[PDB]
């Protein structure tokens, strides 16, 4: 739309929008930039600014496509910590993006899709770069992700418990165990396994789980 | 079916509560009215109350001085008459209305007559009406009893406690200037009955509780 | 565009994940054998002490 | 307000003939009238609802005709037991209620001469203060009769009061009692007490009298 | 000759690096023209520089070039029906875009690749012209001028090998036409290979089911006629001849179901061969195996034909797998719902043995909730072993609910301020809610009605409702027809069947009335109510407080509620006064809605939607008026006003106003009114029956994207309303509204736009059987959730 | 909306008019509802005043010359049956010889009819219909098929003698390879891009020769118009590709004597060294038998709906579908006369012979023509 | 008390006891697998021990079971059997 200019001048224009923080007109500038300059000296910086913007203005699938582009195009680059953290952050933002949080209401009842996506992303990230700045919040978030997973599975279990179905409970339980030990939910979950076993006269297994509690009743 | 309970005699200006009970009907959902008929053939609607206490209508003659109420639990209609005058004396009827069609009545009680007057009740004086046997002796004569200076109406007069029923004519009581009622009750019997039939008239005046059995001798003048 | 105290380094939404709870791992008594560990969820041990949340920054170099 | 005009007040007819009773409404009511019959000594009863519809368990003879200006009741082959007083009633204006005057149904028989009796006052009414000489007409038709009192051949009718019964349910005749009121003092001043009765059932004025000092 | 300095010209992505890479020589090496040749060929290899001039000032090299990259821009002109995205497919298919090939020589290829597209479309009569706006240092805008005259035309197709059949009769099923009808004056006259292939296979299937096994195709030859119009075809075939089915010799792996397996294959002799029946039966067997549950069991028949008499013995072999692969499931689409909300319906569960029937029924009940957009799922084989399978219900969920507002024109105040709101799965919960009311300068109203359909595990539906209709001629509150009321209705709903449900519960209500207007059936009922006020004024009041028992039945064997297409649902509801209360009656009603698809294309469909209602007193009584039925309103019937149907109001001379603006009010003696004033305004009644018969209409010309999210039809609707307690006693001299004989009727269109703001329909029709004064509007709008 | 957005490209319209020798018709004896807006091999014939006509639908006419009087009329369209009454719908023009009349259909139903009544000698089934009208000569019945085949049958009862398979093009494209004879041998082109010499005694391939350019998805030139028939000289044959690539090549071997392969040309007839012909844009040229070297041209009538050309009275003549009719310098190209007659439609062989001139439209049918 | 409309419910892990008659100690996990399908449950806290049970719940009062569990050794070969029906 806006006329052609020096790509350095267009970059400076973007900087003006940035100090302004006008996401929309900045987006206009960036669109004009890449579509008038598909390749440039700072085009890497342009990708960065694009995804920056797309975070601000909630352009999430476009951001995803952009990340994949940059990855295929610059799979080798210094500041990828920012890149991949932004990626997993985006997935995190997606996985809970509702107005329902206004109500103090949980989101442990939907697809654990992008949770696990970002879990994979951040694991790969830190394992590639266990030195950067962006770790600590990622680690906090990873714990949170484990917790959200945990609550979800707990809820599944509890539904089937209300049904009184022991079997899928047992297998989901074992999967949770192989996934992790560590949740208050898991401590809460142990006796539930016990009950469902008890409904099947699994008296051996009943006493097994009894011992489990008896140690780990804490 | 429609049983009425009310005053006998009272003084103008006094109050009085009449009750009326329903026996064989629900008494619910029925519009109830009070309608008075004055001797002299003047018919007046005095009051209406709905099945519930929502709509109550009184006559423009009656005005609020009277109060009409109903109790479904006791199946009783209550009528309070206050501010009473001599004209109010009349036969008062407990009346019902007609369900599911409306706009007209169906049931009336026997009717209870109220008589307001400043005068006091007076016991009757009984006088024999000996039979005029001078017209004929082979024919049929008539004899009676005269109840005079009795107040208020009515007096029940029979002969031989109802044993003798030979075409009895009791003329309606007429009011003399003194204000007391007076009537004659006669009966026509064959002249042969004289000396054969005992003629005793039994007169009862309930408001004064006076029960007099007065005998008319069989003499053929 | 809608951002007060401009979104140069700050965080969208809440921070409860920063305030979230710690973890507990089991002593797993003797003779009663728990399930083994599996999966990618083994949590490479941090060596952190780095900024977080609003204290942590957001920007292209 | 509304005027329930009913004429004639009293009617009479033979057995088997039909009657048309007129009832006139002042405000041209859109057919909102009810007919009620009150027989003597009985509670009033319902005759016609809707101004043309007969009530349950009632003979078809009775019929309702006419419009708001004027209505009529038709009784066909009327029987002896229908003698009662009949009224009209409007329900078009609900808050107030106007009834008819009552139409008094009589029967038509041949002329009947009353059997006249005269009863002198008993000797117990002379010890108070008044003497009552009574003239009696027993079974007559029609109601119209002139009875005048004669004392020592002196005419007087301003102290006497009459009472007439309703037409009998057996012979459809009337009975009248004419009471002549004097004082015991004034009773014992004159000799002959006579009552002369002139009636349609009588061919010539029948006088019946009594003398004092006999009975 | 030794190069001393090289002018490494080359720009816009490259620098001295790539040119020096092109050159073999540094400053101080012998210089050549093999550098010229190598630079030209390498720059045509890469495709950066359209030319090279590697010259030498003495022994000092210099490079002068032109560049194929940046194409600054593109323009498309005359691409009538073809859209620039497909043009972009052609371009990226050519590997041509910004910063890419050049050399105007290539235009023929470009135009060729354009012609090719049309050459594939069905056209050949067209061309394109590319044009360059040159722009500085390399750059060019490429404007494309599309000379698209007209595609060729279908003429006539002949076939030979057709003695038993006409050609046209078999043509009759094809997409294509060598001629259009007149009872369908529109109709395509185009070409396509794919539609042709379908017609070919259709013929194959036709002659299969008429039994011709010796049918084949030999070939088929299109006429490619000069002048770019004539496309005939001539088709080479074997007619063959039909056979007759003689026997069946199935075998295979059975797991001991062989009896019922045969029960599928039960057939009569003398019935002709038809491989369609074969395929059908095979699929039925697959389904049977799914019932016990077998993932991927093999089927294969064998037509052992005897040509000596043209018959066949149909052998079959079969391979059953194994069972109870039921490990887990997944769901996708849930960003608002909760997982339990699905599983509650899922008659199948994890950790079981399989039944595909369960899964089908789960989809069915799911959609019957009508709480989604799109549905599908996959029986994803588990890779760990050939013994387990998981599932994914990867679907979409609808954002919906609706705030209600606005109404047709009216007073300055009295066309707004009205509440009404729906979520129905409130807050993504499945708790279902509807809340409404309105404030007005002559009445006010509130009502709430909310249900949890799943208070328990079973689909136990706990519903409760209240109202406070504060109607007293609001903001006057004196000498006006007040009916203030408020009450409750709370019940339960029991899952009875997979398709059938019951309802039962109670209500407790209070009414309150003042200054009532003389009307006729009003005082009729009220004299049945045993209350006999005047019939003249409006100084009158009455109230009640009563109980009631409500209940109902529901059938629903159906596809969905989003835009249902097939099945039916009916809602029966009855209710009754109870003993001990004030008023005595029943009211019963029933609303049917049936959908019948013509084809399973799900685009030409029938609707039958009706309502049937009646209520009446008990104890020889009459129902209170206010519970009357009503009609119209462009939500039950259209082309009329709401509550403007059936028996109507009737008025007396009024004797009471307690006002006189100018006596603007109708029919009072204070105005000068007598002579009973019949009226027109409507009241409702006790008896109702209405019908509606509609054709679903495919949309005229719309994008599938949102046309799938829009619904339309034409209709013919009618109905009627009346009383039985009508009479002729004093009703005479007036139009007797007794009998269901003043029947009202109309017909028109239905236009269902689905916005994200709730369901919204505009409407047009026309009354036919109009009777005494009844208002209406054809052009109407509404937002309600009527059927 | 879409009913109004049509697009089209246009031809040339008429130039100035000549009447240097004024044209007319002998008469017109037009025919019942025949062709319609279609295309065909079909054209009528005549010999010895015995006029040979028929229509697309099934009707058949034998007429008198000099008036077009119907001598008799018949129809293969059977009054019985259920085949749309068995309409003709033909793939072949007239052939006649002896006392018999030889026609082929779209239906591969192939009719020999006794002359002087048109009564059937026989009808015969074959495989595939004709891009090229039915050839019969030398006691041999000779068919080019829609199936890319030869069919060779009896010239006495239509009995088969042999049949050959030929390569098929990709899209089965319409055109023709009009077969002809040489000394008792078969010779014809092919939409593959080939031309074959074959033994017409048993269909024994003698040689084949590829003619065309080499380009795919650009298939053989649509504007390289009809008359793609061999034209033989003592030891050479002359004909085009369906590109318009001209070749003069060995009558016995197919080896090239010369070629104007580079030429793209539409319709032609040969007169000594003078080959008078149509060009791609439908201009006209006269070319040489040694190189298609322009002896003259005329580009006044272009993109037009024209049939093949002919000679008449020493002036070269052709018309169009819109009844425009053009008599032209056999010398340097110039118009000598023009006529307008009709607008029915014309796509068939013009008939100039016996000193006569003869044509037929679709349904504005026969005009017998003089000047 | 009457409730109403209990649904039809199942779990897996059963075909027949004819299969049970085929087998005894000494067989391996694969020996099992060729005819028995997979275990939907085992002993995760000890040896290989597999749980093969029918379970099923019809509508109003009525319930099935037929349970079995089989204990293997360290090599994954059967050592002990315990089959028995509902209770």
Author numbering:
A (entry chain D): 26 to 243
B (entry chain H): 3 to 223
C (entry chain C): 25 to 85
D (entry chain L): 1 to 215
E (entry chain A): 24 to 810
F (entry chain B): 22 to 392
G (entry chain E): 24 to 110
What does the paper say about this structure?
The folding and membrane insertion of OMPs is catalysed by the essential β-barrel assembly machinery (BAM)2–4 which in E. coli comprises five proteins (BamABCDE). The major conserved subunit, BamA, is a 16-stranded Omp85 family member that contains five N-terminal polypeptide transport-associated (POTRA) domains that extend into the periplasm to scaffold four lipoproteins BamB–E5–8, all of which are required for maximally efficient OMP folding. BAM exists in an ensemble of conformations, with one of the most notable differences between published structures occurring around the seam or ‘lateral gate’ involving β-strands 1 (β1) and 16 (β16) in the BamA barrel. The POTRA domains are also dynamic, with motions of POTRA-5 also occurring alongside changes in gate conformation, with POTRA-5 plugging the entrance to the BamA β-barrel lumen in the lateral-open structures, but moving aside when the lateral gate is closed.
The structure of BAM in complex with a bactericidal molecule (Fab1) was solved in DDM micelles to 5.2 Å resolution. The cryoEM map contained unambiguous density for Fab1 bound to the extracellular region of BamA, and revealed that BAM is in a lateral-open conformation when bound to Fab1, as defined by the position of POTRA-5, the shape of the BamA β-barrel, and the orientation of β1 and β16. In agreement with mutagenesis data, Fab1 binds specifically to eL4 (contributing 98% of the total interface area of 934 Å2 as determined by PISA interface analysis), and the complementarity determining regions (CDRs) bind to residues Y550, E554 and H555 in BamA. Interestingly, a BamA-specific nanobody (nanoE6) has also been found to bind eL4 (involving E554) and also influences dynamics in the lateral gate. Interestingly, since MAB1 binds to BAM in the OM of ΔwaaD E. coli, this suggests that a lateral-open conformation is formed in situ in the OM, consistent with previous data. Our cryoEM structures confirm that in solution, both BAM-P5L and Fab1 restrain BamA in a lateral-open conformation. Presumably, this prevents substrate access and pairing to BamA β1 which recent structures suggest initially occurs to a lateral-closed conformation. It may also inhibit substrate binding by occlusion of entry to the BamA barrel by POTRA-5. We were able to show that WT BAM is capable of folding the 8-stranded OMPs tOmpA and OmpX into liposomes formed from E. coli polar lipid (noting that these membrane are much less complex than the crowded OM which contains lipopolysaccharide (LPS) in its outer leaflet), and no folding was observed in the absence of BAM. Both disulfide-locking and Fab1-binding inhibit, but do not abolish, BAM-catalysed folding of these substrates.
